[PDB]
Design a protein around this ligand. Structure first.
Ligand SMILES: OC[C@H]1O[C@@H](O[C@H]2[C@H](O)[C@H](O)[C@H](O[C@H]3[C@H](O)[C@H](O)[C@H](O[C@H]4[C@H](O)[C@H](O)[C@H](O[C@H]5[C@H](O)[C@H](O)[C@H](O)O[C@@H]5CO)O[C@@H]4CO)O[C@@H]3CO)O[C@@H]2CO)[C@@H](O)[C@@H](O)[C@@H]1O
Length: 159
């Protein structure tokens, strides 16, 4: 198969932190696919620079953060290192992402999250649609039983 489960020790305490710091099950599912341990200790920017750089547990790219969040509204591609603050502020991480989705709408947020500025022109490419449904599958799992909100079960889908 191309999706399943895996045990990650401590994951349950990270899930509760996200749900107690302004997150909902929807944010948990997005963050669950981005990283294995719901954290921010991947390589800085996820290896990318300028508008492509990724920050926070959801790996929001800088283009999205500076066009659609109040924390970064109006900043330029050159200030892209400023997004790094989300790596250590979970509440702002979660809040930036919720604000971003509500500025663009769920489907264009998806397109922007996955492809950056160039996705905004067609939110329904197969690539972006494969991101949506994966996240939607994971949400269904976490919402099928509340034990999954505090155990170490990671529901994963292959990209
Ligand atoms: O240039 C376009 C546009 O890209 C934007 O970027 C991204 C970024 O590139 C990524 O797409 C990111 O999303 C991915 C994460 O980085 C990470 O790769 C993640 O990997 C998961 C994986 O999908 C899978 O679930 C995996 O599970 C296992 C399991 O752990 C176990 O090993 C088992 O045996 O095997 C399975 C299968 O592998 O676990 C991984 C986590 O460890 O997948 C994510 C989704 O693809 O999102 C960013 C933003 O959306 C920006 O850079 C933008 O600027 C740019 O324009």
């Amino acid at each position: 198969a191309d999706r399943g489960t895996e045990t990650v020790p401590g994951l349950g305490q990270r899930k509760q932190q996200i749900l107690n710091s302004g997150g909902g099950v929807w944010d948990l599912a997005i963050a669950m696919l981005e990283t294995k341990n719901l954290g921010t200790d991947y390589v800085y920017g996820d290896g990318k620079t300028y508008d492509s750089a990724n920050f926070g547990i959801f790996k929001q790219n800088w283009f999205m953060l500076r066009t659609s969040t109040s924390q970064f509204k109006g900043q330029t591609t050159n200030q892209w290192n400023n997004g790094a603050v989300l790596n250590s502020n979970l509440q702002q991480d979660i809040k930036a992402r919720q604000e971003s989705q509500n500025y663009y709408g769920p489907d264009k947020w998806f397109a922007g999250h996955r492809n950056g500025e160039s996705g905004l022109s067609n939110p329904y490419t197969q690539d972006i649609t494969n991101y949506k449904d994966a996240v939607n599958w994971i949400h269904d799992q976490l919402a099928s039983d509340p034990k999954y909100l505090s155990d170490d079960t990671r529901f994963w889908v292959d990209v």
